[PDB]
Amino acid sequence: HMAMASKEMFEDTVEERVINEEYKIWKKNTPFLYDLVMTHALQWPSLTVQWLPEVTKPEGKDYALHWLVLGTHTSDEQNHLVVARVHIPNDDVTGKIECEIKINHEGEVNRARYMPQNPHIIATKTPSSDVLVFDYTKHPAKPDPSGECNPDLRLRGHQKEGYGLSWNSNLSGHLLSASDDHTVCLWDINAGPKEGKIVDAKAIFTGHSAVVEDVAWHLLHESLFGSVADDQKLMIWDTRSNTTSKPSHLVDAHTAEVNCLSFNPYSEFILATGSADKTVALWDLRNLKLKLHTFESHKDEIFQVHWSPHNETILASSGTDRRLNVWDLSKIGEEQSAEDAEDGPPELLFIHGGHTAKISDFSWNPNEPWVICSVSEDNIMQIWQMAENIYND
Amino acid sequence: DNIQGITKPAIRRLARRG
Ligand SMILES: [As]
């Protein structure tokens, strides 16, 4: 009645102190651990990040241009889908971030992903039911303050919101989406009618019995895709199969809810999975029954997992423990001393401790090896790169 | 031996402790 609503705080003042002191120590250690570390505080936290595939080294400049696809998270005010332009300094204060474009968006951006075949086409997941599609070359350079959201395409099929989003790298226009409605929708944005901005799901997969958390196309076989849900099950589907309620394979992947999955860009067989049981599981398509390996070290739920686009044996995972772990499969099962075994398994390459809140997403840079961008719930975004000294002898 | 070889195990340990 008298007391105000406080969206800060709103924090745990005890945990805050611990987090901050661990951050101070991390910061003075950065010169040892990183060849590059850049930080920026966004006005609103971003739940999503993805590098655009374009890079350029402008003549006469001592840096390189890179682009990020970001989003906004406000429940009170106007949301935007944003493409940021960044200067990453040449290896031979530091750095710069700017806005290439900013697009009026209804509700927060749960996830934003670009179409590999046409990088200026971007799909987004809304707090509503529709997933949206924007062509950013057809939107004004600066957004209208009125806040009107005019997506180039609205895709219908879901009853609730979601996060899982995946373009097909081999089938242009084919998009997958996961949702809290227990389903996984499929669209072909090339077909539909002549007008206007509304297309229907081509398929609605109902194999799951709970909130399906993530979805991903196979990077090599254009008809296979994986799904992951709160029923603790990893399912693998086939599009040319005429049954949308029973997958080709069904796996009891974790003891808790499964949050994310990522196919290896080099091996057509292996797959990784992140769960609420604080572990990442390795999977091979030949035999799903056998869980190849289990990555232990995360102290809390894992929400994102991504393979390196340069090194086939490199894996990264982030979660609620505010840490981003980098794994090297080539060091699995390898022997180690007792003092080293106390820090974690041999495949644990690197623990990124620059974030002071949950990491919502991260993205491997496709043009600069070992460069990553991660975003946390406390408005921070970090573009960083592990010290060469650590991965290369 | 060289000095990098001396600080390689130290840095790699620091990396796995965050
Ligand atoms: As920006």
Residue numbers in the entry:
A (entry chain B): -2 to 89, 110 to 410
B (entry chain E): 24 to 41
Paper text:
RbAp46 folds into a seven-bladed β propeller structure and binds histone H4 in a groove formed between an N-terminal α helix and an extended loop inserted into blade six. Surprisingly, histone H4 adopts a different conformation when interacting with RbAp46 than it does in either the nucleosome or in the complex with ASF1, another histone chaperone. Our structural and biochemical results suggest that when a histone H3/H4 dimer (or tetramer) binds to RbAp46 or RbAp48, helix 1 of histone H4 unfolds to interact with the histone chaperone.
We have solved the crystal structures of two human RbAp46/histone H4 complexes at high resolution. One complex contains a synthetic peptide encompassing residues 16–41 of histone H4, and the second includes the N-terminal tail of recombinant histone H4 (residues 1–48); these crystallized in different space groups. The crystallographic data thus provide three independently determined structures of the complex, representing different lattice environments. The three structures are essentially the same and should contain all of the important features illustrating how histone H4 binds to RbAp46. In the complex with the peptide (residues 16–41), we observe residues 25–41, whereas for the recombinant fragment of H4 (residues 1–48), residues 27–41 are well defined.
